[PDB]
Design a binder for this molecule. Structure first.
Ligand SMILES: CC(C)S(=O)(=O)c1ccc2c(c1)-c1cn(C)c(=O)c3[nH]cc(c13)CN2CC1CC1
Length: 106
């Protein structure tokens, strides 16, 4: 099953090797603590790694493509909300490189 391959992708994205850039994506953006009160006006469908992990464990993805769409949604939200020169955008790109290289191996 390619959903076993999806659990592997998440283990890689949560690994210590990538923590320096993956950490802002581990949990939902805490809009209240960060003062990002315009976030929900710009981002219609928030997504993060812990939510993807919960969805995967709860059989909410029919296949690897549905799983992949939520991972790409997480990165697209980051690219849409932040200015392009923001530190978090560079971090999203580094994490997206980890994901895309592993996802391509299926
Ligand atoms: C529990 C945690 C995940 S957090 O939610 O406290 C948290 C803490 C800080 C943090 C994020 C989220 C953040 C995430 N993302 C997806 C965005 O698009 C952001 N734009 C701006 C920020 C974020 C501000 N910074 C990241 C900045 C240093 C590089």
């Amino acid at each position: 099953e390619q959903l076993k391959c999806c659990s592997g992708i998440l283990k890689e994205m949560f690994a210590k090797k990538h923590a320096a850039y993956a950490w802002p994506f581990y949990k939902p953006v805490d809009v209240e603590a960060l003062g990002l009160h315009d976030y929900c006006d710009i981002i219609k469908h928030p997504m993060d790694m812990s939510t993807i992990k919960s969805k995967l464990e709860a059989r909410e993805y029919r296949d690897a493509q549905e799983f992949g769409a939520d991972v790409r949604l997480m990165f697209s939200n980051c690219y849409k909300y932040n200015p392009p020169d923001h530190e978090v955008v560079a971090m999203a790109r580094k994490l997206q490189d980890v994901f895309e290289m592993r996802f391509a191996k299926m």
